[PDB]
């Protein structure tokens, strides 16, 4: 306002508010690894 000394300050606005919906999809990958490799391939294939 910059309200005066004797002003009788009326109503003022209050901000309109928007909601945005993040959909939160998933992201999935599925490699196929073999049991002969995982038993015999001394590098840790699981954490690799």
């Amino acid at each position: 306002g910059w309200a005066s000394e004797t002003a009788a300050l009326s109503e003022t606005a209050t901000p309109q508010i928007d909601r945005i919906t993040i959909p939160l999809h998933e992201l999935a990958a599925m490699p196929k690894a073999s049991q002969r490799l995982l038993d015999d391939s001394a590098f840790d294939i699981e954490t690799w």
Binding site: R36, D39, D40, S41
Partner: protein, 48 residues
């Protein structure tokens, strides 16, 4: 009158018996944790 008696089955079901002589008795078995195994032989000998 025949319904009220059921035949007695065997206690463990059985199979045709087969031989276990398998050459693993005489060959050299080794414990291996790899995709393969190597053996290293001397196909010749030295000189004097």
């Amino acid at each position: 009158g025949g319904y009220l008696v059921d035949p007695q089955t065997s206690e463990t079901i059985r199979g045709v018996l087969r031989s276990t002589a398998s050459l693993r008795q005489i060959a050299s078995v080794v414990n291996v944790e790899a995709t393969s195994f190597d053996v290293l032989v001397d196909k010749t000998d030295m000189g004097s």
